[PDB]
Write a protein that binds this ligand. Structure first.
Ligand SMILES: COc1ncc(Nc2nc(N)nc3[nH]ncc23)cc1Cl
Ligand code: NI
Length: 316
């Protein structure tokens, strides 16, 4: 049995990245339903899989500490340099949150009030595959049910990596694994309900119709609007999910996912009503309008601004 590390447990095996808590609060970013793979196994100690390796992460007021578990009896070492660049990109630490917060606040007094208690909210840069199928599971769910669905999906279809304590960590499947004949049947047995069709179908579609997972990398370089359009061709992927994926895995920071929660915020908190739309409630067109509303207000990181409000909408 190998054990989940704390910073006490084994300070030999931790490395560190200079990170102000104001640029990144793990506790706000790892649970909040960007990823559904990180758990707080021990207090202030976040463990989950990234690119077929397990990590535990923790931080101070100016340091981000991390440790790696490779799997098959390699010899426990501290994170390498390459392994630390991986983790730097995932947090997109090149991006100054302080600068964006100040810009947003300058045009949005609502944001000024809210954002003081929610510093260090940034977007993860996720693997498009994992993001896509995670958000295909997102329809008509809460975060807890999705967390479960993804885990069970990974344990049943994904490579085993390592076991720590009672937790067996699997990597995310490849498209072939998800597009198999018995897939939906199995996924349905794992509690995914209707979504099981969309997972299998989208997997099968990305292979055949789109020419493998390279297609998703293309969308990452493709401009926002083309990426969105492209994603909406997939089974179970509509505007909202496409915008999630755009924002969280295809480097489109201006993507603003609109559902009924954001309708509610926009109306209550910003006094927004659909103008160029007739009908007084959600619709593909009115949603699209609301997205443009926020882009026009917050600028080309509108999605990142939104993420701060979202993170204030799960903390009462
Ligand atoms: C602005 O940045 C963000 N946008 C969306 C999410 N996550 C979700 N949104 C919605 N409407 N439903 C969800 N179900 N499960 C997750 C999730 C998170 C952020 Cl930070
Ligand atoms: Ni009103």
């Amino acid at each position: 049995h190998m054990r989940h590390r704390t910073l006490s447990s084994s300070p030999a095996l931790w490395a560190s990245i200079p990170c102000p808590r104001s640029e990144l609060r793990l506790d706000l970013v790892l649970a909040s339903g960007q990823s559904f793979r990180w758990k707080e196994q021990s207090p202030a100690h976040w463990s989950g899989v990234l690119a077929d390796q397990v990590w535990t992460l923790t931080q101070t007021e100016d340091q981000l500490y991390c440790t790696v578990y490779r799997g098959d009896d390699s010899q426990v070492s501290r994170p390498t340099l390459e392994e630390l660049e991986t983790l730097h990109k995932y947090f997109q630490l090149d991006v100054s949150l302080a600068q964006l917060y100040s810009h947003w606040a300058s045009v949005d007094s609502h944001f000024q009030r809210v954002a003081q208690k929610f510093q260090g909210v940034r977007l993860l840069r996720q693997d498009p595959t994992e993001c896509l199928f995670s958000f295909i599971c997102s329809s008509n769910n809460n975060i807890a049910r999705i967390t479960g669905m993804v885990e069970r999906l990974c344990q049943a279809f994904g490579p085993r990596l390592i076991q720590l304590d009672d937790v067996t960590y699997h990597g995310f499947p490849n498209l072939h694994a998800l597009a198999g004949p018995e897939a939906e049947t199995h996924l349905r047995k794992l509690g995914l309900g209707y979504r099981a069709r969309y997972v299998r179908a989208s997997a099968k579609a990305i292979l055949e119709e789109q020419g493998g997972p390279a297609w998703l990398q293309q969308l990452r370089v493709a401009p926002y609007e083309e990426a969105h359009k492209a994603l909406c061709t997939l089974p179970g992927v509509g505007a909202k999910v496409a915008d999630c994926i755009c924002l969280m895995a295809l480097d489109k920071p201006q993507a603003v996912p609109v559902d009924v929660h954001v309708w509610q915020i926009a109306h209550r908190d910003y006094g927004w009503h659909p103008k160029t739309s007739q009908a007084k409630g959600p619709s593909p067109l009115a949603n699209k309008e609301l997205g443009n509303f926020f882009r026009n207000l917050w600028g080309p990181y509108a999605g990142w601004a939104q993420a701060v409000l979202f993170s204030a909408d799960l903390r009462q």
